[PDB]
């Protein structure tokens, strides 16, 4: 079962778990109220998995590639890592399917409090266009992920504040409608 939680008040060491004390876990159901959706898959089968295919056809994820984040192999690693963890939004979905390793996606809740989502091998997530979010490796310092997109990808982050965008306005309108 995928783990999410509200974060403590420490700003040091972003790769540590930062669990609030006492524990305040967050369910998949609460995540859905933020428009964040999740699927569990057999990541060993990612090259040929009818269950992944079902998701891609349903959601129109017509594009994909594979990315590996580790110090030793990713081009421009240090700057990419910094950019990932700056709070930002996109004008499209951010869909990531974890094939090896792990990481944290943090998202803002309806009161703009951080929720940390621990993503591991087999976990697939979509963060809706307009949601403020960030990503960091955890202390294992390694992740291999499939990136998916609705059509040809545009990866551009808009670092908060990015409130003027239509995608942000529509997302805010979506949040009024959920529990």
**Residue showing tokens 């697939």:** 124
Q: Is 9 annotated as a binding residue?
A: no
Should residue 92 be labelled a site residue for Ni ion when binding is judged by CB under 5 A?
no
| Closer residue to Ni ion, CB minimum distance, 94 or 106 | 94
Alpha-carbon dihedral sign for residues 158, 161, 164, 167: positive
Region from 7-15, 30-38, 86-94, 169-177 binding Ni ion, contact rule CB under 5 A: 86-94
Quote the Cα angle for 17-18-20, to 5°: 130
Q: Is 90 annotated as a binding residue?
A: yes
CA–CA dist 125, 103 (Å, integer): 12
Should residue 94 be labelled a site residue for Ni ion when binding is judged by CB under 5 A?
yes
Q: Which residue is nearest to Ni ion (CB)?
A: 94
| Closer residue to Ni ion, CB minimum distance, 101 or 128 | 128
The distance of closest approach from Cβ of residue 6 to Ni ion in the complex, given in angstroms and rounded to an integer, is 20
Closest C-alpha among 133, 151, 152, 34 to residue 89 = 133
The number of residues that bind Ni ion (CB under 5 A) is 1
CA–CA dist 165, 11 (Å, integer): 28
| Closer residue to Ni ion, CB minimum distance, 99 or 145 | 145
CB 56 within 8 A of CB 62: yes
Annotated binding-site members: 88, 90, 94, 133
Residues near Ni ion (CB under 5 A): 94
């Amino acid at each position: 079962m995928v783990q999410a939680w509200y974060m403590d008040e420490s700003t040091a060491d972003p790769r540590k778990p930062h669990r609030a004390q006492p524990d305040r876990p967050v369910s998949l159901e609460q995540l859905r109220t933020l428009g964040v959706l999740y699927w569990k898959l057999d990541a060993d089968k990612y090259e040929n998995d009818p269950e992944l295919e079902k998701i891609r056809k349903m959601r129109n994820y017509s594009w994909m590639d594979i990315i590996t984040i580790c110090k030793d192999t990713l081009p421009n690693y240090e700057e990419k890592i910094k950019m990932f963890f700056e709070e930002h939004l996109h004008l499209d979905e951010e869909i990531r399917y974890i094939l090896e390793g792990s990481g944290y996606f943090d998202v803002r809740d309806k009161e703009d409090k951080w929720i940390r989502i621990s993503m591991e091998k087999g976990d697939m997530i979509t963060l809706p266009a307009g949601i403020y979010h960030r990503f960091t490796l955890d202390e294992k310092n390694y992740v291999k992920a499939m990136r998916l997109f609705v059509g040809e990808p545009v990866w551009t982050p808009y670092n908060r504040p990015a409130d003027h965008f239509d995608a942000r306005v529509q997302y805010m309108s979506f949040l009024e409608g959920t529990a």
